[PDB]
Amino acid sequence: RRWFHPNITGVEAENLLLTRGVDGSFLARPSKSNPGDFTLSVRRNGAVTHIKIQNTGDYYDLYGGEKFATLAELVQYYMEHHGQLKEKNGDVIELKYPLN
């Protein structure tokens, strides 16, 4: 999957999304704080947000929400339902355009 950025830092994710993206662009990359896991770096209102993806070994989810068997499945749900990712305080973060 081309939105999957394997060896990229949150810093280079922000580099790419601010120079190569538009609002609504996103990518998944691996976690820094939790080695072996992933993170979604999404672009909203000219800045980048990072969302941790929970891999429980039984499913994937966004530490709450629908659960998925694969990462690409998760990304497709959120792409196909742009109202479904809300950040605690109500605000919606749309995953609209894969960065790549």
């Binding site: 949150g10 810093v11 800045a47 990072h50 969302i51 966004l62 530490y63 950040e87 973060i93």
Partner: peptide, 7 residues
């Protein structure tokens, strides 16, 4: 980084 609070 600009990390969302997962909660």
């Amino acid at each position: 980084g600009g990390y969302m609070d997962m909660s």
